Design a protein around this ligand. Structure first.
Ligand SMILES: *[C@@H]1O[C@H](CO)[C@@H](O[C@@H]2O[C@H](CO)[C@@H](O[C@@H]3O[C@H](CO)[C@@H](O)[C@H](O)[C@@H]3O)[C@H](O)[C@H]2NC(C)=O)[C@H](O)[C@H]1NC(C)=O
Ligand SMILES: *[C@@H]1O[C@H](CO)[C@@H](O[C@@H]2O[C@H](CO)[C@@H](O[C@@H]3O[C@H](CO)[C@@H](O)[C@H](O)[C@@H]3O)[C@H](O)[C@H]2NC(C)=O)[C@H](O)[C@H]1NC(C)=O
Ligand SMILES: *[C@@H]1O[C@H](CO)[C@@H](O[C@@H]2O[C@H](CO)[C@@H](O)[C@H](O)[C@H]2NC(C)=O)[C@H](O)[C@H]1NC(C)=O
Ligand SMILES: *[C@@H]1O[C@H](CO)[C@@H](O)[C@H](O)[C@H]1NC(C)=O
Lengths: 48, 106, 105, 105
């Protein structure tokens, strides 16, 4: 009682969303650290 | 959208719908095939709108009423008419073989 | 390389091209619904229209149903090639002419 | 690439290119419904793994010119066969009645 085999119907699996937290943390920490270093530099040679 | 939308590779939609103001109109040129799969992922029953005839390939064809009362059923055993009435519109009519047993002729 | 839409999508007109077969999601169902409109399949002249009330089929021959297990046509509408056998369960009959031989109660 | 819709898709016409077939697939069922304004199911077709069941108020089959080759409504089942043949050897039993305008041995 089998008509076709069609080994191509592969539904997408239970693919959860990719974790954006790590990359967002990286691309938010890099400019945050840059801005903090900039503020330190501004204090250093603006107040001396 | 506004216009066409080409699609390569399969389309794993959840529930296709139709516009309120227009009737959904699936179309093809060779055939339109609707399939189904068992727990083993194998095609067992399928309907096919072909070139000239609509072919239904399954194990038990059935036609029901809106509520759910059976109205017609064809399977491997024998065809069954559940409405309790048949009507042949052919000019040649029925051609019985030996005898007929009814309590009323109208 | 897999887009995952997550909102009500209005694709308008869809044009499948190659290796694109509309399929249901992973192991639940595939429901096609028409909001107060008929759902009409088509192939040249052959049709299959799920309207309100009725469920019409239009073709030059008609519907044909056969069991794939044994490949014998269980019920065909091509009456000339496949004769019609009386289905069991009929309580009354309405024919244009009965060529019987004897009627008994 | 592959596309998955997590929400009800909307479409107007699903055409197919010439020389290319249109396919519908699933893993459990293919259900075609029709809804009214209040959205209750009126007509419904289910292409199950083993059973193909049609619902509604009237199911009919007709030729392109228009001729009822089959129609199974609630009241009666009309069949367009030009001649129905019964091959029973011991006779047939109709519990209710027959309705003919002509009887001819
Ligand atoms: C519905 O229509 C489509 C297209 O008209 C049918 O698909 C066609 O099926 C035939 C039968 O196998 C294919 O012919 C051969 O296919 C093999 C597959 O490997 C190929 O190697 C051969 O060279 C030859 O082409 C044909 O290619 C295929 N066409 C397409 C576009 O896929 C389908 O069978 C029809 N369904 C029914 C139920 O009739
Ligand atoms: C997919 O489609 C198939 C075929 O339409 C469905 O199987 C059928 O489902 C109905 C509804 O549950 C079953 O009817 C039931 O019958 C029992 C008696 O056996 C009765 O007590 C219930 O009240 C009901 O009327 C029917 O038997 C069943 N046919 C089978 C299993 O061969 C199936 O449910 C569908 N699945 C989904 C997820 O939609
Ligand atoms: C399916 O049912 C609808 C609803 O009863 C029918 O619509 C009727 O159509 C006739 C003639 O076209 C009108 O006079 C009625 O006013 C309609 N009814 C409503 C409620 O609008 C429709 O005709 C039916 N389809 C078929 C093929 O009989
Ligand atoms: C879906 O694919 C992912 C790949 O990341 C895999 O881990 C998961 O097991 C798959 N789910 C199923 C149900 O196969």
């Amino acid at each position: 009682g089998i008509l076709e085999h069609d080994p191509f119907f592969c539904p997408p699996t239970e693919a959860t969303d990719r974790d954006f937290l790590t990359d967002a943390l990286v691309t938010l920490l890099v400019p945050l650290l840059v801005a903090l270093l900039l503020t330190l530099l501004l204090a250093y040679i603006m107040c001396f | 959208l506004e216009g066409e939308s080409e699609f390569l590779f399969p389309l794993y939609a959840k529930e296709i719908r139709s516009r309120v103001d227009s009737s959904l109109l699936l179309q093809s040129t060779q055939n339109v095939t609707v399939s189904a799969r068992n727990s083993e992922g194998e095609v067992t029953g399928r309907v096919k709108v072909g070139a000239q005839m609509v072919e239904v390939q399954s194990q038990h064809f059935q036609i029901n009423s809106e509520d759910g009362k059976p109205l017609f059923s064809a399977e491997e055993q024998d065809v069954v008419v559940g409405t309790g009435r048949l009507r042949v519109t052919g000019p040649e009519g029925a051609l019985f073989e030996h005898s007929v047993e009814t309590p009323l002729v109208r | 390389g897999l887009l995952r839409f997550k909102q009500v999508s209005d694709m308008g007109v869809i044009h499948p091209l190659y290796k694109s077969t509309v399929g249901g999601r992973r192991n639940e169902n595939l429901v096609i619904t028409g909001n107060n409109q008929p759902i009409v399949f088509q192939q040249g002249t052959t049709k299959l229209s799920v309207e309100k009330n009725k469920t019409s089929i239009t073709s030059d021959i008609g519907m044909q149903f056969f069991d794939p297990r044994t490949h014998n046509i269980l019920f065909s509408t091509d009456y000339e090639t496949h004769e019609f056998h009386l289905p069991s369960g009929v309580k009354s009959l309405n024919v244009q002419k009965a060529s019987t031989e004897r009627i008994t109660s | 690439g592959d596309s998955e819709f997590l929400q009800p898709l909307y479409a107007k016409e699903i055409k197919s290119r010439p020389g290319n077939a249109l396919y519908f697939k699933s893993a459990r069922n293919v259900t075609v419904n029709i809804l009214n304004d209040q959205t209750k199911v009126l007509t419904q077709l289910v292409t199950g793994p083993k059973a193909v069941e049609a619902y509604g108020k009237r199911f009919e089959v007709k030729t392109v010119s228009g001729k009822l080759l089959f129609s199974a409504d609630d009241s009666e089942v009309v069949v367009g066969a030009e001649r129905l043949r019964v091959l029973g050897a011991e006779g047939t039993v109709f519990p209710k009645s027959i309705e003919t305008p002509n009887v001819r041995a």
